[PDB]
Design a binder for this molecule. Structure first.
Ligand code: OTI
Ligand code: OTI
Ligand code: OTI
Ligand code: OTI
Ligand code: OTI
Ligand code: OTI
Ligand code: CL
Ligand code: CL
Ligand code: CL
Ligand code: CL
Ligand code: CL
Lengths: 155, 149, 148, 150, 155, 148
């Protein structure tokens, strides 16, 4: 099968690939943030949303990879090679999970449309030559809960 | 965090662990069954169901685990050592994914209630001594006169 | 005192003894089934039933027995006598607890009469010569309030 | 599973463990008291109460531990005092059963509320320094129409 | 800063000092009593009372002190010097926490006034020569606010 | 007992531990700020607030800890282990008290909801890669005669 984990969420692997690897927080920091903001939802008996369901699996999958990588490492006769398999996972699959965790955590806070627009905004900014672009990166931020039109309507 | 992947689906890790490892099809056979029955839905831009969403991730996660386990296996000296990794996968994370893939595929066909009832039925049958129990395993499956007047 | 643990549940040690030891699931499998089916009730602050009360104590007692048996195994100077302890447990107190756990778990699922009738049914079948009896064993198949 | 045998009776292992081991009668004396006061009920075909059901199992469980201990001493000991196994049992699991038998026998006589209050009363008394506390321990105890005189 | 932990509770360090060290249960026995009587309240999300808030911190502080003393003790190889750490705890900070835990646990059960009156009663009794005083110590108990006659009068 | 000192104040240890250790002022700087802003309230015979009650105990507890550490340090044989005591304080109990003192002092100034929101804001900012985030950290922030 050819399954793109972003496709049911309105995105693609190629679109997440538009961002440089340096854009994404680390796996540990994504996992810490998922816990700080969404632990209760993620641990609840309710689906909550497709993003929650996917994020739960992504978190556990990283755990599966690290548990396997740690176990083999303990079996490597060279004690200096203890985290060699763990390093292998980070090198070849770490970026994939950073993209995926970032996507779901961000979508849960900002909504798909805002996240996808930000992906484009940053990817265009980082491809503009540094001496020709605004010094600071674009900012990821939430939409207003109420529009100016609605606010003025109820004056 | 402590996330139980079955909890949002009305089950638990402990409940799936009630079944012996020999109960489950192999991961390869589970993956081939998911493809034969649900490939178009799994590859679609539609969520379809929480089971589809979870199953998509599990399928992809197993691919990651196999690339890792294959990399360790193909780069490991000694047949006994590679036997150990294959054994470790068989005993631990392979069993986890056999449970998980079986659960989601079965739920997509029979519904949660039927699946959970079958888990108990088989788990009780296999714990009954063979000489005392029915020879075959339990099976997973799904008008008045007035009516004619 | 002479207490029969089955007496308040309508049975006796003698009746459970009518079944061959091979009839019963293992202690481990009985404990796993009690957890799979009744963990929440067994761990709850509610009595639930006399079967739950008895089953709670039986589960804890087996833990006590295993801790004692482990201490005997580790403290016996001779390795051959450790073997005797295990075989003694399997033959004697392990069988007692297989009977007891099976009885209460089955009663919680099927009710007292069905269980008592099944004990007799299987005990009669296994005593019928194999070449003269049905090829398969009889089947165990089908509450909230408890009088005295 | 994590089963607390006191939980269905409104108590916990931790609560019983608030009492020092010296608080409790010996297992033998608890068993003699169960027999003297409740033998007929314990041996009857009636449930009687959840306390009776639990007490029956606890009495039989101690029998199982002692039968095991005695059998090892008889068969697997020669010049050993053959009381080595029996001695370990009374050292570790004996306290657990003194708590359990005492709880059920006391509840059958005084009721849960009075028993739990007494556990707290004695636990506080024994933790008060002896030279600062009352000399005697707290005590476990529990407690006509007008027309007649007109 | 010079803070007296009793001042917001109507007492002082000097007043608790009026009681001899032998008056107090050990820290362990005070902690075990706090758990037996107040565990649910102490672990709850509600303030409950200023005594509860203070008692919560005292329990945790003792944990901090013993964890530090343990780490020092277990990482000191000479056994005599480990006994020096224990003696320092017993001599100095153990008495401070025995006073403090006793005060808060007693106040939660009997109220401030009864506790302070009892502090005085015992401190006076123990300073009376043993051959001249009642054989038994005064008793900590809640006194009745009204007499039987008064209670019957307002029936 | 398992007491979370933040629980009665609407937070948890895990939430405070979302912030990196470098976020917090030193214990000394927290204590000096508490004295500059709240000394009279803290030394008063009035409860003032649950935050004041908790903060009083934390201040005294730090005094207990440092005298113990000083007594150990001044009686230790070799400076390398004197350095070990300081390092233990810096890594373990100093971090706990930096979190705790900061929480109470900040709550007394800004209120719980502002503090908890700021914790999240900074914790997310510091986890954003430096080259991708705003250059500055988020900020913690909140006649008489004519009407006679
Ligand atoms: C937790 C939700 O995610 C965010 O809020 C995320 C953010 C939100 N932004 C964080 C940095 N920023 C501030 O501090 N701001 C300050 C203020 C005052 C609020 C404002 O000016 O508006 C704005 C800006 C907002 N940025 C990003 C990324 N930016 C670039 C590359 S990555 N990723 C995630 C994220 C981050 C860390 C861990 C995670 F796990 C995740 C998912
Ligand atoms: C595809 C949905 O799953 C099933 O249908 C599943 C089945 C369905 N059963 C298959 C075997 N059976 C028949 O052929 N039957 C024939 C008939 C005519 C209908 C009848 O006699 O009633 C009944 C019985 C039904 N059994 C199981 C398991 N049984 C025991 C241990 S495992 N697991 C899954 C499953 C299986 C393979 C790959 C998968 F990937 C999965 C998930
Ligand atoms: C969990 C309740 O117990 C049972 O259900 C028990 C059973 C239930 N039976 C299990 C075997 N069977 C099937 O799979 N059946 C299939 C079907 C379709 C439902 C039907 O034909 O009706 C019937 C038959 C029913 N049998 C027994 C024993 N039989 C003989 C000796 S022992 N003991 C217990 C038990 C078992 C294991 C662990 C335990 F822990 C216990 C207690
Ligand atoms: C049999 C019910 O239990 C009791 O009555 C129990 C008692 C009852 N008390 C017995 C001692 N007492 C008297 O003699 N009293 C005499 C009188 C005239 C009424 C008075 O002076 O007031 C009061 C006082 C009541 N005390 C206790 C415990 N106290 C402290 C630690 S243990 N445990 C159990 C118990 C005891 C033994 C074997 C058991 F098996 C048990 C269970
Ligand atoms: C738990 C509340 O504290 C008490 O109840 C406290 C008590 C209560 N007293 C306990 C001793 N007593 C009884 O048993 N009494 C009842 C009795 C036997 C029926 C009778 O009247 O003769 C009265 C008398 C009341 N005494 C004390 C202290 N007394 C002297 C020095 S210290 N300190 C605390 C306390 C105690 C232990 C652990 C703690 F942790 C604490 C705090
Ligand atoms: C004393 C109350 O606490 C504060 O005010 C606290 C602050 C207040 N902030 C101080 C730094 N800032 C300014 O100078 N600002 C300038 C101005 C003009 C007023 C504005 O733009 O608003 C804003 C910003 C506000 N920041 C913090 C922390 N920020 C980041 C990590 S820690 N912690 C505490 C605190 C600090 C020191 C000792 C303590 F002890 C404590 C508790
Ligand atoms: Cl095949
Ligand atoms: Cl009698
Ligand atoms: Cl409580
Ligand atoms: Cl006295
Ligand atoms: Cl001031």
């Amino acid at each position: 099968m050819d399954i793109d984990p972003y496709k049911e969420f309105g995105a693609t692997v190629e679109l997440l690939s538009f961002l440089p690897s340096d854009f994404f927080p680390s796996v540990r920091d994504l996992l810490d943030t998922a816990a700080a903001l969404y632990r209760d939802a993620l641990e609840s008996p309710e689906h909550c949303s497709p993003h929650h369901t996917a994020l739960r699996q992504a978190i556990l999958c990283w755990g599966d990879l690290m548990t396997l990588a740690t176990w083999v490492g303990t079996n490597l006769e060279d004690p200096a090679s203890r985290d060699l398999v763990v390093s292998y996972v980070n090198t070849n699959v770490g970026l994939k999970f950073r993209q995926l965790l970032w996507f779901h955590i961000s979508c849960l806070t900002f909504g798909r449309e805002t996240v996808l627009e930000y992906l484009v905004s940053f990817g265009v900014w980082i491809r503009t030559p540094p001496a020709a672009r605004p010094p600071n990166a674009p900012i990821l931020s939430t939409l207003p809960e109420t529009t100016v039109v609605e606010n003025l309507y109820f004056q």
